[PDB]
Amino acid sequence: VKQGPTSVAYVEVNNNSMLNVGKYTLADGGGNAFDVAVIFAANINYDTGTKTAYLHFNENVQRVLDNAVTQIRPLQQQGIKVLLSVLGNHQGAGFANFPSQQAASAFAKQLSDAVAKYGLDGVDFDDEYAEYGNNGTAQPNDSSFVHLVTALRANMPDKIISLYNIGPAASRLSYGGVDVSDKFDYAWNPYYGTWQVPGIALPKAQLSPAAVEIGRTSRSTVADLARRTVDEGYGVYLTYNLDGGDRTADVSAFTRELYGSEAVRTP
Amino acid sequence: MVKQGPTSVAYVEVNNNSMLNVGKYTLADGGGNAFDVAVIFAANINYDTGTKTAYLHFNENVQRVLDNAVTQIRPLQQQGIKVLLSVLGNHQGAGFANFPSQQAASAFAKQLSDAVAKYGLDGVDFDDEYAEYGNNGTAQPNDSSFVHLVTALRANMPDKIISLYNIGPAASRLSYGGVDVSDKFDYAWNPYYGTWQVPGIALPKAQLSPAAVEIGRTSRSTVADLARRTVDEGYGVYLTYNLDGGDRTADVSAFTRELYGSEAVRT
Ligand SMILES: [Mg+2]
Ligand SMILES: [Mg+2]
Ligand SMILES: [Mg+2]
């Protein structure tokens, strides 16, 4: 019954629980304050012996996935999609420097295998901390990310793929006559506290020019950025770092503008 | 063998890293410092509900760095590197923009100047985040508090450095009662790491850093691009944040090549 744009919440599972995303609803009965929860974050690692990238989960990320039944399914039951973000991890392998289509495809299978095993709704790409060049890896090239996303989308035609619009991967979305922009569901501004339209050939309904960090970004700014989201006709609103505290006022700061309603907490 | 180029600045999170790393990077051509200004991040503004009076608060690590200034600070100053103390909100309602009166703002300013002199610092940096205006029965930001505080502070230290992290309520409230305090600052920089945003402040370009980079997270190519744009366009400051204890020779040289025409070298 809620109508406005799609709300997104990155959660740093190293410090906080995914379930807090589901504790905020709209006073006027519209539904959840948040539409998408993102687990931050899995990693892309490099195995120097085999000279091969692989998907890696730290102790915290692995705990959330292993406990998907208490840590994920309840959000999904409420209607909240859950994604896994993937980040560089200082080992030289990154989303933009796969040496070949087959190599990018091997990684896509690992991502899609993880989405399937743990019942996830999709994946989010964050191309930072890769440290391209460590362990004798190559610098970014023009084809790696297009190959990777092309394979992932073929693997998961029904799942969400989203882009944290930063890093070398973000500027390499077209290769060999294929622009993979329409293979993403969403793209959003990575600079928390600011408004910045992603220059990506995706419709406005799937873009978040605004990005805020709950608990740090001024409530004045949260509200203004959500008002601009609606005013200019955009369809996504990115938030990061919701914790376990009482953020009713922080959340209401944008639910007031996105949905015309204030937020209430479940406990 | 002197260095010609914009003044580079290094925010150091002392909760995790030592100030001394800032002095560990010199230029391969001439041996000047890669970094001209180190900023201890960060002291706090607390409220104290009894007195109803804001006070300068140091956390365990900041207190340790200041108490041990002889080994953590003086070596940098003796190497020619100025050392500033950042001040940040701390969730207790008092912030730089909601002092109720000139007198109370002047009282907090005396605490800052006193601490500058006691520990032999070179000045103070303002970061107006996390204050949580309204907590403990505090007021919302007003138009006068920050002008009063900066006027009193500059009166206390005519010879010291006062810098502005360009974010938060205080950074839009620089004029009141016929007094514009823009020229009372020595520097003002973009808070949005990874980006280029010229502060809209009535300071000369030589005292502005539109560039902001996080060492170890911002891509080296972005570090270099922003450093090149700083020289082009003619700005006088280049802000870096979060230098750690690892070997960041390639990250530092990424900007020193463009700022000063020379690679950096560690130890
Ligand atoms: Mg689509
Ligand atoms: Mg395109
Ligand atoms: Mg700025």
Numbering used by the authors:
A (entry chain A): 9 to 275
B (entry chain D): 8 to 274
What wording appears in the published article?
By engineering a protein that dimerized through a highly solvent exposed disulfide bond, a system is created where disulfide bond breakage leading to monomerization is easily measured by SAXS. In this way, SAXS was able to follow a residue specific rather than a global damage process and link damage pathways seen crystallographically to those occurring in solution with much lower X-ray doses. The X-ray radiation induced dimer to monomer transition was pH dependent, suggesting mechanistic processes, routes for further interrogation, and mitigation strategies. Here, our system is engineered so that the reduction in scattered intensity is from the dimer to monomer transition through disulfide bond cleavage, making a global damage indicator into a residue specific one.
Comparison of the elution profile of endoHCYS in size-exclusion (SEC) chromatography shows that transient disulfide bond formation leads to dimerization in approximately 75% of endoHCYS (60 kDa theoretical, 53 kDa experimental) in solution. The protein crystallized in space group P21221 with four monomers in the asymmetric unit. The monomers have an average RMSD 0.289 +/- 0.016 Å to the original monomeric structure, indicating that the cysteine containing fragment did not affect folding. The cysteine containing fragment and disulfide bond are un-resolved in the electron density but is not unexpected due to the deliberate placement of the disulfides in an accessible and already flexible region. The position of the N-terminus indicates that the disulfide linked dimer forms between monomers across adjacent asymmetric units, yielding dimers with chains AA', BB', CD', and C'D. This arrangement with the N-terminus of adjacent monomers positioned in close proximity is not seen in crystal structures of monomeric endoH. The distance between the modeled N-terminal Val-8 on partnered monomers (13 Å for BB' and AA', 7 Å for both CD dimers) is such that the length of the introduced fragment can satisfy the gap and connect the monomers. Aligning the dimers shows slight differences in the inter-monomer orientation, which is most likely due to crystal packing. A PISA analysis of the interfaces within the asymmetric unit suggests that there are too few interactions between crystal packing oligomers to for those interactions to form in solution. The difference in the location of isoscattering point in calculated and experimental scattering curves suggests that the conformation of the dimer is different in solution, perhaps through freedom crystal lattice restrains to rotate around the flexible linker.
